[PDB]
Amino acid sequence: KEQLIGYWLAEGLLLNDSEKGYQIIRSLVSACLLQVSGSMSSKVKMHHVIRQLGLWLVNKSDTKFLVQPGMALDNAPSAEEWNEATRISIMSNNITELSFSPKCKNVTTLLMQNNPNLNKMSYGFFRTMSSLKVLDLSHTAITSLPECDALVALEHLNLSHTHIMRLPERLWLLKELRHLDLSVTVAFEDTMNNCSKLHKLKVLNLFRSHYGIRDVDNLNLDSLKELLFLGITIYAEDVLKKLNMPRPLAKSTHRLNLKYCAEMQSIKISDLSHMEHLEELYVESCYDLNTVVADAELTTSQLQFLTLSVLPSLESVLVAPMSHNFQYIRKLIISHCPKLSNITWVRRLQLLERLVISHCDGVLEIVEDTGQSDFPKLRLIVLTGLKKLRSICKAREFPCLETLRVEDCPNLRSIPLSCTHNYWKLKQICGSVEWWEKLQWENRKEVACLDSKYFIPI
Amino acid sequence: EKGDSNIIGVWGQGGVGKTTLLHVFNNDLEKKAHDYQVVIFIEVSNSEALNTVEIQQTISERLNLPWNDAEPIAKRARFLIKALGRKRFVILLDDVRKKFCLEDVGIPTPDINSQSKLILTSRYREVCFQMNAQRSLIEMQILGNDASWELFLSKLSTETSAAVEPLGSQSATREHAMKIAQSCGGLPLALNVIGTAVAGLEEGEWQSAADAIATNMDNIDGVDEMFGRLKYSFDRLTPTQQQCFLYCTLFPEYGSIS
Amino acid sequence: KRFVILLDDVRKKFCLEDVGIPTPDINSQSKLILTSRYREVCFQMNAQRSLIEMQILGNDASWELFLSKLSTETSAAVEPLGSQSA
Numbered sequence A: 001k002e003q004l005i006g007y008w009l010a011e012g013l014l015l016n017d018s019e020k021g022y023q024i025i026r027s028l029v030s031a032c033l034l035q036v037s038g039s040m041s042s043k044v045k046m047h048h049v050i051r052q053l054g055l056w057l058v059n060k061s062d063t064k065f066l067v068q069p070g071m072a073l074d075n076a077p078s079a080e081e082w083n084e085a086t087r088i089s090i091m092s093n094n095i096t097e098l099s100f101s102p103k104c105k106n107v108t109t110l111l112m113q114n115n116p117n118l119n120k121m122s123y124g125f126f127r128t129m130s131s132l133k134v135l136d137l138s139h140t141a142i143t144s145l146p147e148c149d150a151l152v153a154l155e156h157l158n159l160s161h162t163h164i165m166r167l168p169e170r171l172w173l174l175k176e177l178r179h180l181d182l183s184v185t186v187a188f189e190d191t192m193n194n195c196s197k198l199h200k201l202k203v204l205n206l207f208r209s210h211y212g213i214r215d216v217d218n219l220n221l222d223s224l225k226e227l228l229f230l231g232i233t234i235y236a237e238d239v240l241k242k243l244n245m246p247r248p249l250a251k252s253t254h255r256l257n258l259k260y261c262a263e264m265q266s267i268k269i270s271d272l273s274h275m276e277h278l279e280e281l282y283v284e285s286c287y288d289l290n291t292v293v294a295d296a297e298l299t300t301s302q303l304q305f306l307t308l309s310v311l312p313s314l315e316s317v318l319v320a321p322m323s324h325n326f327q328y329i330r331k332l333i334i335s336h337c338p339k340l341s342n343i344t345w346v347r348r349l350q351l352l353e354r355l356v357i358s359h360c361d362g363v364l365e366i367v368e369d370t371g372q373s374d375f376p377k378l379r380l381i382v383l384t385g386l387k388k389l390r391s392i393c394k395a396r397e398f399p400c401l402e403t404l405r406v407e408d409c410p411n412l413r414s415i416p417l418s419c420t421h422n423y424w425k426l427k428q429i430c431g432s433v434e435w436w437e438k439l440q441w442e443n444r445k446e447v448a449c450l451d452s453k454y455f456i457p458i
Numbered sequence B: 001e002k003g004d005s006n007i008i009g010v011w012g013q014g015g016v017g018k019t020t021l022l023h024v025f026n027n028d029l030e031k032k033a034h035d036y037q038v039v040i041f042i043e044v045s046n047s048e049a050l051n052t053v054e055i056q057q058t059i060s061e062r063l064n065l066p067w068n069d070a071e072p073i074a075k076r077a078r079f080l081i082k083a084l085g086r087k088r089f090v091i092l093l094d095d096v097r098k099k100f101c102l103e104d105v106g107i108p109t110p111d112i113n114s115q116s117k118l119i120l121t122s123r124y125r126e127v128c129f130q131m132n133a134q135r136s137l138i139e140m141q142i143l144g145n146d147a148s149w150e151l152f153l154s155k156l157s158t159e160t161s162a163a164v165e166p167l168g169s170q171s172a173t174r175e176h177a178m179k180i181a182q183s184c185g186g187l188p189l190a191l192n193v194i195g196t197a198v199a200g201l202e203e204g205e206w207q208s209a210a211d212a213i214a215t216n217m218d219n220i221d222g223v224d225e226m227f228g229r230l231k232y233s234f235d236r237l238t239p240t241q242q243q244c245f246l247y248c249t250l251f252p253e254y255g256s257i258s
Numbered sequence C: 001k002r003f004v005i006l007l008d009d010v011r012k013k014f015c016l017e018d019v020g021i022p023t024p025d026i027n028s029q030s031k032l033i034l035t036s037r038y039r040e041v042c043f044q045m046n047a048q049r050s051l052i053e054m055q056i057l058g059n060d061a062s063w064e065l066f067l068s069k070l071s072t073e074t075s076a077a078v079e080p081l082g083s084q085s086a
């Protein structure tokens, strides 16, 4: 929903209101034109017949669309078809080369997301794209991007998960830009000091980007006067203590990534209390990180999604027993942490919804040593690659779970799921037969019951 | 039961519950014991032109009278005045928007010497004063803090209500739903329309809807016909009064002005 | 009377008492079932507490629906099992 609402905002369909986009999505899903589907209601989709009806209506309309996504296209379509079209979509195709320069005078949207091999776009491709308002090149392999001084009216530009290393200087002359996203750009290394010329920008995202504000020299984001939401990667303690004051640049951040953290052997949520908008934290390759403090001192910031990845020295996180900042958590992803050996705090996470535990052999159990279950709102559990895990947690009731998936876990002995629960929300269970052989059971009927009811082999 | 004047007026803003009050009052008379012989419910809200014909049709049908279609309106009015004078009647008038003469529609004005009563509801205190109901006026006030909330709850679907109903388990969705309910100002029409609009809100969407409802109401379903319904009180005004009313809208919300 | 009224494909909110149907209440045994493409209409008509969603047909039921729609000779080409064909 968020991605679609972003485009609805850039395209001008929404008068700068995201709630209007949510209302439109809800009106569509209430008329059965869209379907809410997924592990969480954040994703929408179209029924096949409804999509064909939409394409038929587009063909009946006087404004042509060029729509070939998911067609497994191996080469770009003929450049002559791009003349009169207004919306172009080349999603999920295997396009490898984009060399022609089209005549797209009327186009107001370009989508090339999920093109894994498209890395050679011809220079001067955007010459006729003056009216292009939405441009998406997410999850493509381009390392360089053609000059775009002709993009006078562009307002949205997405380059997440692409191999772009340096970003052309023509963007700072794009006066109409409103949203620019370069999250998870592995190769991005270009200084953003010229972003000050981008006054009109409203959203800038660098979450999980390999490059960011490595030093205070590039803390000049106070020139971004129109900015509302930002995500960036912070590398050092001195940066945090330069940002640990109440000002918009500190509080406007909604999520952080922590990579190659220097001198940040410990961190407290009280230190993040000045980040009143922060909701997601990512910690990757923090070599000297040892402990984290989950204080009882609450914050207006609501922590929602966390991911701990590739941490070779993290040991434990101190979580208060009665009240804590983690109680608003929705998603936890624990990955590649061999020295982490304390995850007992999860049982106090009553709003928690998603579990991802992977390759963390230091975790003995997900919950090691009120008339309420420890996971009252849980929906999804994902387990992968655990070579030394014993069991998940003690015997508790799990009636609200939707899906359980376990892969490559030859050491897992048992799971807390049992036939004692009532199930209507448990949609499916996926896993291996060897895990079923190694599974301990509360009752010997569970050998066949939990297999014939929900288990789906991998 | 006890008021001295036989003409009773109820006034209040659009959607406060005047017509529903008349319905629940008429339906309540059949439960208790009373000396009255006919309880007539008449919808004068049909127009401001006072369509005499169907009002007389309702009165005659309610009095077991034959409908002489070709009879002149004045003769029928005199005949109804004679007929209604023989019975202890209660006439409930709905949303009377202009002063109109009762004797020209067939209704005799009740007096102290007669046990008959006449209850009229209108948005305007000026109309209730013009119809000689000054000594028995009642102001129909908006709903209370708790009654408005429990009205809002009944308007939500089962799964949606299951998110905001429970206590003991604490989450901000209850606060967002309560903010949306308070944005209705306790007006039953507002509670109905807004609760119907957000009757199917999922758990995670309450925040944005509650945040947006505090500032604007054009993007929410069913409120356009709400404002069309409430707009008559504004269209009745003279252009100077219309400009003076719009001039008051730019003062801060929840703030009294001198 | 204890009535059951089945309304089909109601596309806008309408007043039942204007058409002559009394709205059923807890005191009465009468029922009223309405079908509509829009959930907003079903909420407007006071059916929020008893809403059902009509889901699409299953994988196998849809197939056997498709089979019954074909002619005899055409069905004879796609019905048989044991013999395998594209």
Ligand SMILES: Nc1ncnc2c1ncn2[C@@H]1O[C@H](COP(=O)(O)OP(=O)(O)OP(=O)(O)O)[C@@H](O)[C@H]1O
Residues within 6 Å of the ligand: B013, B014, B015, B016, B017, B018, B019, B020, B021, B095, B123, B151, B188, B189, B192, B229
């Ligand atoms: N006490 C109440 N509880 C629940 N709903 C109520 C209550 N009072 C009024 N309503 C609702 O108010 C809505 C608006 O219609 P209502 O008959 O109340 O209007 P009104 O006060 O006569 O105003 P006007 O005639 O000027 O439109 C009705 O649909 C009814 O359901």
